[PDB]
Amino acid sequence: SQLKLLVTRGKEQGYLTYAEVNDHLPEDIVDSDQIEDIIQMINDMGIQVMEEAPDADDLMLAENTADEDAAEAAAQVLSSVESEIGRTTDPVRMYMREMGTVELLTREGEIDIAKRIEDGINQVQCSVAEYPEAITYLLEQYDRVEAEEARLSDLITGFVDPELAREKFAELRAQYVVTRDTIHATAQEEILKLSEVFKQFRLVPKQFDYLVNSMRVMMDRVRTQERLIMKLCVEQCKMPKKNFITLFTGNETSDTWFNAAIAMNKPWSEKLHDVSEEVHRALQKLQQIEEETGLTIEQVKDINRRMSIGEAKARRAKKEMVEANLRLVISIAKKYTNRGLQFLDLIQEGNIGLMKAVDKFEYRRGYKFSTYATWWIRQAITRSIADQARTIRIPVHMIETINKLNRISRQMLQEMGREPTPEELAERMLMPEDKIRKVLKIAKEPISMETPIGDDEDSHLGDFIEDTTLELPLDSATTESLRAATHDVLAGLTAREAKVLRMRFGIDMNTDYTLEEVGKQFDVTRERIRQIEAKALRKLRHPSRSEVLRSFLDD
Amino acid sequence: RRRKLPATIILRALNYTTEQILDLFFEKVIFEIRDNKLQMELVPERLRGE
Amino acid sequence: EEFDAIKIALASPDMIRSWSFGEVKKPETINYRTFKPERDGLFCARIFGPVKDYECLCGKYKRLKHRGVICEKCGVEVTQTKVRRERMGHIELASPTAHIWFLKSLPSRIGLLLDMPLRDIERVLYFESYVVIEGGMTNLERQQILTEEQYLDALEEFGDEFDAKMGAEAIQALLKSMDLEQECEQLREELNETNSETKRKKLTKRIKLLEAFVQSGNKPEWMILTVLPVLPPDLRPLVPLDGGRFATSDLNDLYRRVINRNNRLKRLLDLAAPDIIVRNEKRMLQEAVDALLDNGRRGRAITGSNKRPLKSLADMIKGKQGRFRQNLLGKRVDYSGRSVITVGPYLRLHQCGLPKKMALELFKPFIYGKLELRGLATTIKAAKKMVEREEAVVWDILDEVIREHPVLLNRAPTLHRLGIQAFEPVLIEGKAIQLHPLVCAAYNADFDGDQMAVHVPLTLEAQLEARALMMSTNNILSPANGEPIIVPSQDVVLGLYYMTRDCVNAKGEGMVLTGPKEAERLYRSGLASLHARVKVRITEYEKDANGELVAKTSLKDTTVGRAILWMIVPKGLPYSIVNQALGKKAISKMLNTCYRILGLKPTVIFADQIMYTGFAYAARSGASVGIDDMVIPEKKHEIISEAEAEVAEIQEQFQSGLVTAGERYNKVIDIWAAANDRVSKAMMDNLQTETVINRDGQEEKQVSFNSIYMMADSGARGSAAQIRQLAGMRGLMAKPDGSIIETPITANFREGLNVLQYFISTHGARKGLADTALKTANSGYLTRRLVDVAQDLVVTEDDCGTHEGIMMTPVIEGGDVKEPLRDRVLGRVTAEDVLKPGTADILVPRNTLLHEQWCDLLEENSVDAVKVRSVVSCDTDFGVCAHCYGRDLARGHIINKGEAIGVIAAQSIGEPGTQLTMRTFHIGSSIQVKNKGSIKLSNVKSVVNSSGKLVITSRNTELKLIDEFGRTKESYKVPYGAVLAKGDGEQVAGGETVANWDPHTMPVITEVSGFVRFTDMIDGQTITRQTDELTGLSSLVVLDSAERTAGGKDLRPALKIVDAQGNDVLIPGTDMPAQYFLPGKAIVQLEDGVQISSGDTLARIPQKDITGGLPRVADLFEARRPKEPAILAEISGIVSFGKETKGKRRLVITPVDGSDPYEEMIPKWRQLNVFEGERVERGDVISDGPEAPHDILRLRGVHAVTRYIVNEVQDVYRLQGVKINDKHIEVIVRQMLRKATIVNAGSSDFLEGEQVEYSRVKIANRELEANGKVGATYSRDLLGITKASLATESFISAASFQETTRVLTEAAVAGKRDELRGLKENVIVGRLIPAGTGYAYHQDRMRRRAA
Ligand SMILES: [Mg+2]
Ligand SMILES: [Zn+2]
Ligand SMILES: [Zn+2]
């Protein structure tokens, strides 16, 4: 309320001061960012100071702006900011406070987190070995790759020589074909052999993404078909959840639990009659998916469910670890705070790097994950500070050369005493004595074109850079005069003369022609064109006919 | 330039209590009761123009 | 491209794609090796067009014929390179983002559009707190925000049928999901039911907002950007500076940041990082975009590699360097120049000198045209080489281009519209612009190195305007008053004042001359001095006949000097004008009479002849100054000894304890200033009549020819003050605190000044400097603020057709008439016809332009008031009719149609404002008639007492002074019940007292004469035991509230008047019986037991600074209510008291019968100057003090407040002695009181308590009541200029001088189709101004439109 008393005093007295506002303010905030916000609000309020000094005379005397409908909202913002709570300001501090709710240690709890990660990858790996189109995709890639339409080392990123991989491709080919060539006597044994021959291989992450995306599309197909079934039965016929799932569960393959269900003498059966064909199509795509794969749609669901749960566990372990290591990222990113980039940009590059570190960690070499990910963080932030810091972007090797020059410049600037010359840098460095000129030309920033060149009334460097490409009005007038002159000159010829001498040039037309088209016009792609052109050139060379033209000669 | 405060707060924080504060920032005028109704000490300079 | 009104509105996304030329995707700009632009970054080729005109990027297609074809290799549309300046590309912001203007504008656009406070919006945006977006109907309000844990639970609460987001996605969902017609219906509902004036006030306000936002073409979700356009490439260049160093603008930096963060957010989304990562990234992108737009309102700017905050798109429009104020009004100008001005007296006043070289550089195109015309160069290049050789013939051709071609000559600050005058040229050797001399007073330009600039008018309309409107000899009347501004200034007037004076015995004494001609033939040959008193035969031509000139020879008795001055005076003037001393005031009213009699041509040629002869005889005087010229008084040493002994007296008396230190200081300073005035008078009387010379006899004394005295008498320079400082002592230096030092300077400048005295002088000298340094740097603030409010005002009707003006009379402030009537009804046009005091007549028709002939008649018949038509009551819609503005102008005829009077009005009020002290500045009981003349009483309520004398029983009886003419010669304001002597409308004798009263104490004198008793006077309760107890005066005086009991506060202190028995006679006319009641401090003296006489002091009741600076004028036009507001009546009726002393006692006034109940709360710390038993007229002084102009406007009416403002600001000027005609202040007032308020809308469609401006509502009810329907009551407002300019039909105008951001955003949400037809508007958008010559053009477009 007292800050409202500051408001009324600012209304009456006609100003305030840093001491006045700092007196009335609500205690216990004092971040000096909330303060700057509230001072900007009081400025936006009726008060227009904010002061330091009380006055003020004839120099801009008796100033005021009503600014109605801003006072009622500004004073409202004040009374609300004081009464409720103190709001955070900026976003670096947002990030700090929001991550400070992270329990900031995993002293060998990293082992459990990596345990969960391995759980996810291994459940999805069982999904991999069990997904038929996975092995068919591998076999298809093998054939495409062998012919030479693709590489073996591009598809799979090593097991736990591409000929070893290829004989293994044939081994798994025989495994998968023997799995498929028993259509129900030994199918479980077959899948067992297939899984235990495929569960020590590996692929590119993008090949695995393609596998998972064909899998996700399979799921999307099955989900659209279950829509076609249930949203067309239940939500189209008053066939409720219980009376639909009584026949939708367990077998979930045959058309009977829909068609014969139509005949069970029920209201939903008396409403499904026109949706009969639509759900028939639904179960037909479902059994065609069956045709596709070989496993029931319920096995489809169970497999993708296990995959999804492993994926969720792995993502959650990733999240938990990254929340932990955000502190590490902040600590390591503090060390580049004026490279030409923001603190938050550095720490976001670090976030990306830490994510890659998580994705490429293993305890099977006994690492300590903190110092492991420190490298990835520093490398990603270095790559970023190189790539997207300079205004005009210079490449990575060029930035390495530039920092080499700076290191050697410092070393020489206290070895030689005064400073080094390019001729001396081209022998401490071993560059060609000209690349150093180009490097130390290039590696400097640009000047800010709103730089204050305060040597005037009030100016800017931008207001002094003239325009170079504009054509002088003298030039434009001369051009128009020359057009008129040469037009009258060319009128001072014959029709055939003027036509050929316009065409072989670009005068009063589009771009200028060739002797081929000159001949396609005047019937003679031959010396008639040359005759006319050169003879008219001679004719216009006549002084007393081209004297004005040669007066158009800027010599 | 932070908030204002009662200026005696710094003096109390300097290991001063109220008695020695008052006897730092004031002279003294005594009052007595010598057999009758609140006698007074009176230096000639004290009561100028009142 | 004569398009239309400009239009503004929200930036719909698909619109932002239609503006596009391909998405910017990458942060690169250029290629670090080849400085072509990388594709595609902030720059590009395929997006924003080709680099080189008609040339591809890779270079496949390089001919004009191939324009249009996009190269198959790098898709660059081969076209001009200025197409690089108009293409806008867009960005595809992955997550949405909130436009900072429609977030932090102040009143949040989203806040009062969603019905939601701002802090929750910042929560949902910066991810502080979740928020529902159509949470269905289970538990949660739509706007109901949440927090983390609450959303976590609620997902377990209602995991289904639930919808909660946070981020820009949330605000966009809310705005989109909103449906505005629903909220209009809901708000009209709660306007129906909820009958709470505050409540349904804000309810109907928000419904006003939503209906506005619906009736635009907008949609509520367009405030949240999905697609963000990049400025083109060439408005934020990356210029190659010399050395490889590039000097880029800052928007490249900001867009690089935003494109980085957008790409990084997309990259995060592909990985699906944990939510802390994506949240911090979206916040970073939000801050990046918010720094792109405004770089402020966000709390802390993001400064570039400097420490200087980098400018942004809301900052290239704003400020005194944004495009509005810095490149749409102040733009450099080809065909200009400048130089040092100089003197050049050999010129007629219509031709400025000018150098050959500035001429041959300004008029190169003209030269080139002429040289290809006369065949001196067949081609233009040859002509250039010629005129760059400075050959022989280009000077001849330049003299043929500079024959009639007026150059505009400007000085550095151009305050008033004479600041920019044109001239012809006259080619000159040298490089100084030899300006004329007379015009320097107009420019305000001495020749101490001041630099005037010459422009050139290119076209042919501009040449006719630089000849027929801006030529030098068409602006000699100052725009702010009719007096000529060609006053001869310093060497010219000294020349005349030396020429036309008379020494007593010069050669050629008394000899008669045959005319002026042989007066010159005598002087030049030397037979007689230039001045020695002499009979001549002048022949003056008076022109009393209708346009005739009747010659009349005579023998005036003159000098030779006056006669030789007479050969230059033109015909119509009479010889008594040049027979006097011809000082500066007289030599200027010479020109004034010339212009008032003979028109303009002879006044121009006569001002030139005056300057010529003035310079000539001023040089012939040899008027030099030498050190024997400053004569000290020989009675100075005595005066200084005498005062320095009086200080000895006060020193001795201070050290005897008799006077305080303040008193001795004041007395010392008093005796020194007295010695100062005595010494100055002694020198001035040793100086003026000092010369004593002798005609053929003993001796005789005359005004002197001490060179410094002529220089101080003519008006050339200086005055008696500077002559004081040169000869007498120089006063008391005032130290800059304001306190005057007490150690005077007993020395002067002819003597020395020892060290102390000079040093003490330094204080005041440097204060003068430190103020005229702040004045020259803040000189045009007042004109700026006035032309902001009074600009779009143009005299756009021939005759408004009304009969309602303001009544003019000569101001008289209790003494000699300050401002007569011929200075106020000089130009304005009458409102209702004027009748000679018998009515006798119809003296002047109502539409007669009162030029000086009609003022002649009015002053021949002694007319006292002339109800003259006035600008503030013109009945024109968006304009001011031709007549009612009157006539005043640089010309002397009626104001033309269109001539932009708002600007010249603001400048008439603002250019003398340079001539006023910038610091504010404070100057600080019987009536005595001056002379013969009858007495005149207005509002006089007198009683014929049994004593005989006269007493006024009306609060407001003005005591005037009328003669037998009938004129009002004097007026005085009698206090209440002053003892009056003479008759009411009768005759008195000159210089005789006629009214006396009580100085500090208020009589309560009775009404009629009847017996007396008391009522409710109990001591201790209502009265106190007062008495002049040495005399027996039993005074049981009324007790106040703090001494009357709490039932005593319920008591009524009273004075009953009994008749002869015990009853109470009716008050005569009314039926309130005979008695007077009284307030606290109604000090009673007598008691019950006497019959009263009319004029009985039944009680005794006890109880101006004029700021004169410029800031008094600034606050007058700001109309700020003063500190002590003059409490003023509210309803014309009887007075009474109210609820007694609830802190502020409550008055109560009552009419005869009507709406009586008005009671007013007053701080009872202040006197109430009203009786307890009277009938206070509406608009009557209940209290004293300055009365607020708003109260004038609301109680009395328009003409009252306008006469108030004009007389107040006229006081502020004619205090300082500055003339400014009242048309200008009246027009600035007509711009002040423009808005209006409503009482009962009725048969119109405006909200009742809404504020709307007068012109709109007046045309509305004028056309409605023109129908059979009924009007709409409106209560006029009155805004200060700084707020009355704050409302503008256009937004292009209000985007200049108001703060740009609020203007743009308010117009933007409102979708305000701003027309043109202002002056800021068209000067911005660069078509014809609709003020001057452009007015006929705009009438042309008005005809085009609407047909
Ligand atoms: Mg000067
Ligand atoms: Zn190309
Ligand atoms: Zn009018």
Curated annotation (Swiss-Prot), chain B:
Q: How is it modified after translation?
A: Acetylated on several lysine residues in the presence of glucose.
Leader peptide range in chain numbering: none
Any recorded use in biotech or industry, and what is it?
Co-administration of salinamide and rifampicin or salinamide and myxopyronin suppresses the emergence of resistance to both antibiotics.
Where do the coiled-coil regions begin and end?
none
- Job description of the protein: DNA-dependent RNA polymerase (RNAP) catalyzes the transcription of DNA into RNA using the four ribonucleoside triphosphates as substrates. Resistance to the antibiotics salinamide A, salinamide B, rifampicin, streptolydigin, CBR703, myxopyronin, and lipiarmycin can result from mutations in this protein.
- Oligomer and partners: The RNAP catalytic core consists of 2 alpha, 1 beta, 1 beta' and 1 omega subunit. When a sigma factor is associated with the core the holoenzyme is formed, which can initiate transcription. The rRNA transcription and antitermination complex (rrnTAC) consists of RNAP, NusA, NusB, NusE (rpsJ), NusG, SubB, ribosomal protein S4, DNA and precursor rRNA; S4 is more flexible than other subunits. In pull-down experiments interacts with CedA.
Sequence similarity: Belongs to the RNA polymerase beta chain family.
Q: What is this protein called?
A: DNA-directed RNA polymerase subunit beta
What is the name of the gene encoding this protein? rpoB
From Swiss-Prot, chain C:
Query: Could you say which EC number(s) this protein's record lists?
Result: 2.7.7.6
Broadest EC class? transferase
Entries under Pfam families matching the protein:
RNA_pol_Rpb1_1, RNA_pol_Rpb1_2, RNA_pol_Rpb1_3, RNA_pol_Rpb1_4, RNA_pol_Rpb1_5
* Binding residue positions for Zn(2+) 2: C800, C874, C881, C884
Q: How is the cofactor bound?
A: Binds 1 Mg(2+) ion per subunit.
GO CC, any one term: cytosolic DNA-directed RNA polymerase complex
A molecular-function term among this protein's GO annotations: DNA-directed RNA polymerase activity
Residues the record lists as binding Zn(2+) 1: C56, C58, C71, C74
Q: Report residues binding Mg(2+).
A: D446, D448, D450
Annotated effect of mutating A721T: Resistant to antibiotics salinamide A and B
Under InterPro entries, the record lists:
DNA-dir_RpoC_beta_prime, DNA-dir_RpoC_beta_prime_bact, RNA_pol_asu, RNA_pol_N, RNA_pol_Rpb1_1, RNA_pol_Rpb1_3, RNA_pol_Rpb1_3_sf, RNA_pol_Rpb1_4
Q: Which cofactors are required for activity?
A: Mg(2+); Zn(2+)
Post-translation changes: Acetylated on several lysine residues in the presence of glucose.
UniProt keyword Transcription present: yes
> Which biotechnological use is given in the entry?
Co-administration of salinamide and rifampicin or salinamide and myxopyronin suppresses the emergence of resistance to both antibiotics.
Q: Which UniProt keywords apply?
A: Acetylation, Antibiotic resistance, DNA-directed RNA polymerase, Magnesium, Metal-binding, Nucleotidyltransferase, Transcription, Transferase, Zinc
Output one GO BP term: response to antibiotic
Record flagged with keyword Nucleotide-binding: no
Q: Which reaction does it catalyse?
A: RNA(n) + a ribonucleoside 5'-triphosphate = RNA(n+1) + diphosphate
User: Of which family is this protein a member?
Assistant: Belongs to the RNA polymerase beta' chain family.
Described function: DNA-dependent RNA polymerase (RNAP) catalyzes the transcription of DNA into RNA using the four ribonucleoside triphosphates as substrates.
The record's listing under HAMAP family reads: RNApol_bact_RpoC
Q: What is this protein called?
A: DNA-directed RNA polymerase subunit beta'
> What is this organism's lineage?
Bacteria, Pseudomonadati, Pseudomonadota, Gammaproteobacteria, Enterobacterales
**Which gene is this protein's source?**
rpoC
